[PDB]
């Protein structure tokens, strides 16, 4: 019935992004509902194919010989449903590299075993998107604060590793979530909380920070704006909707080309500001991409 | 090697003992990765991206191969996947089991159609 059925899901309201809510409980109208799916769809085919067709509304930097990493992309089916979609996604040849904590069967061009933590790269990359969810943030036993574990790992992954005008897209839930992430959005020329129309009854969204600037743009606070992100949850319920799966005619990521270029930080002007945030601009070298797993030897 | 390549040729039969799996009446491989895709693609077999047309559905080429969901050595030279990293178009009447229908199948080098599925090279 409403008008966003037909889109791949919502974004995050700008006046609910400039409210100062404190934080309260999320209660979805609609909470545990499952979507309707196409006929053998799984869910996370479903999900991962409509944050792939929100990204392709952005201005996301597409260079040749593009570096993508997938971080939580395991299962408990031993298959990687998002990495298979993002693989079918990306123009041909991107380098898609994905990790997870338990051992998985992928179509990524290589797979890493164990912690996030254990995940080493000297490269820089263009787009990092993270599935990740510690199975004990449902043992909520406490107030509902900003959690660590791998998400201080993706904090410095992006402020390390993350090419400026690359992209990101990192899941969060009422209670898988952290502040230092939040503040990060504001490092990017734009950024927003995308809720997939299939997972319309769940608290989970993709933070999304669109184009690096690799400096602050604007001050956010990441416990403000989490409490807003429930705020627009709880008074915005969102019907369900599988509807922009059957169109799949644009699926594909617009190859765009877009230039790399290696540039010092005292290069970094509002001229190449300006490109970074149109999607025009990736900024690293473009060496061979080396990656490495820690391997803790014990008796 | 020889001994123990001697032992696995034996023994790892992988293809057959499915086959034998499925006439026990064992339930057939899940969790193969369907696609979302338009339906109106080339048909061929094993692509870089979906290339299901009406009559198929398309697969991540990993999920629906039996040597890396079983996690046992290929017999391809070098261990080299031919499923993996790709897609694999299967007709809807076998989509229920698409493990058992890459085993049981072999592509054209030709056309790239399945043979007995698609490739018409024999007229
Ligand atoms: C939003 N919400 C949360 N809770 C309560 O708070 C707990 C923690 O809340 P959460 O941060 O996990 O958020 P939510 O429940 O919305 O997450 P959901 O289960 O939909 O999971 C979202 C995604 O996280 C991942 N995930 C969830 N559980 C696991 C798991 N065990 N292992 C791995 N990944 C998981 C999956 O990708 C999944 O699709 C819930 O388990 C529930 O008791 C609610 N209760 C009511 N009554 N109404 C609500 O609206 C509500
Ligand atoms: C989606 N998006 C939004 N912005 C900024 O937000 C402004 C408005 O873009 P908008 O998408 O928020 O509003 P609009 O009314 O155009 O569309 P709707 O909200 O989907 O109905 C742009 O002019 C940019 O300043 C964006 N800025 C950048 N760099 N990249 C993006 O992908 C992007
Ligand atoms: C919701 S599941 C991911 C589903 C997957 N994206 C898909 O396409 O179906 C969340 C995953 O995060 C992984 N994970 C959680 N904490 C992790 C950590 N610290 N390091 C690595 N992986 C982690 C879990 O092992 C689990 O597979
Ligand atoms: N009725 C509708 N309104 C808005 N967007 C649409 N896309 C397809 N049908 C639509
Ligand atoms: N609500 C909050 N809880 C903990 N630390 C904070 N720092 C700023 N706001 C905070
Ligand atoms: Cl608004
Ligand atoms: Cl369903
Ligand atoms: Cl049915
Ligand atoms: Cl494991
Ligand atoms: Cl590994
Ligand atoms: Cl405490
Ligand atoms: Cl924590
Ligand atoms: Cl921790
Ligand atoms: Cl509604
Ligand atoms: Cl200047
Ligand atoms: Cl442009
Ligand atoms: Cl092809
Ligand atoms: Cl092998
Ligand atoms: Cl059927
Ligand atoms: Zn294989
Ligand atoms: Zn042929």
Redesign the interface.
């Known amino acids: 019935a409403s008008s966003q059925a037909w889109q791949p899901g919502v974004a995050m309201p700008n006046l609910y992004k400039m409210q100062r809510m404190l934080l309260e409980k999320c209660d979805l109208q609609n909470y545990g509902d499952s979507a309707t799916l196409?006929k053998?769809?799984?869910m996370n085919?479903?999900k991962y194919?409509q944050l792939c067709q929100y990204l392709n509304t952005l201005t996301l930097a597409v260079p040749y010989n593009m570096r993508v990493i997938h971080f939580g992309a395991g299962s408990d089916?031993?298959?990687?449903?998002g990495?298979?979609?993002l693989?079918?996604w990306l123009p041909?040849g991107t380098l898609l590299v994905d990790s997870d904590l338990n051992?998985f069967?992928?179509?990524?061009?290589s797979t890493l075993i164990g912690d996030c933590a254990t995940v080493h790269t000297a490269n820089k990359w263009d787009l990092i998107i993270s599935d990740m969810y510690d199975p004990k943030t449902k043992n909520v036993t406490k107030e509902n604060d900003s959690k660590e574990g791998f998400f201080t790992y993706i904090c410095g992954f992006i402020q390390q590793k993350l090419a400026l005008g690359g992209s990101v897209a990192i899941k969060i839930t009422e209670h898988s979530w952290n502040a230092d992430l939040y503040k990060l959005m504001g490092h990017f020329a734009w950024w927003t909380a995308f809720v997939t129309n299939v997972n319309a009854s769940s608290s989970e969204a993709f933070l999304i920070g669109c184009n690096y600037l690799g400096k602050p743009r604007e001050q956010i606070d990441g416990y403000v704006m989490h409490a807003n992100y429930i705020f627009w949850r709880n008074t915005n319920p969102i019907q369900l909707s599988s509807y922009s799966?059957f169109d799949?005619?644009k699926?594909?990521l617009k190859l765009r080309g877009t230039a790399v270029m290696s540039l010092k930080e005292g290069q970094i002007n509002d001229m190449i500001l300006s490109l970074l945030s149109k999607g025009r601009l990736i900024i690293r070298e473009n060496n061979r991409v080396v990656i490495s797993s820690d391997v803790l030897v014990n008796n | 090697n020889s001994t123990v390549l001697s032992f696995c040729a034996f023994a790892v039969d992988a293809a057959k003992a499915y086959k034998d799996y499925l006439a026990s009446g064992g339930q057939p491989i899940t969790?193969?990765?369907?696609?979302?895709?338009?339906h109106t693609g080339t048909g061929q077999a094993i692509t870089?991206?979906?290339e299901a047309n009406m009559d198929q559905?398309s697969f991540?080429?990993?999920?629906c191969?039996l040597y890396?969901?079983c996690?046992i050595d290929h017999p391809n030279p070098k261990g080299f996947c031919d499923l993996?990293?790709?897609?694999v178009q299967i007709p809807t009447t076998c989509?229920n089991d698409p493990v058992g229908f890459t085993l049981k199948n072999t592509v054209c080098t030709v056309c790239g159609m399945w043979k007995g599925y698609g490739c018409s090279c024999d007229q």
Request: proline content about 7%; overall charge positive; some cysteine.
């Open positions: 196409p053998g769809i799984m085919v479903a194919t089916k031993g298959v990687a449903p990495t298979a979609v693989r079918q041909t051992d069967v992928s179509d990524a061009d799966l799949m005619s699926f594909p | 969790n193969c990765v369907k696609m979302l895709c338009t870089v991206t979906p559905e991540g080429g990993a999920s191969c890396c969901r996690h993996k990293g790709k897609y989509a």
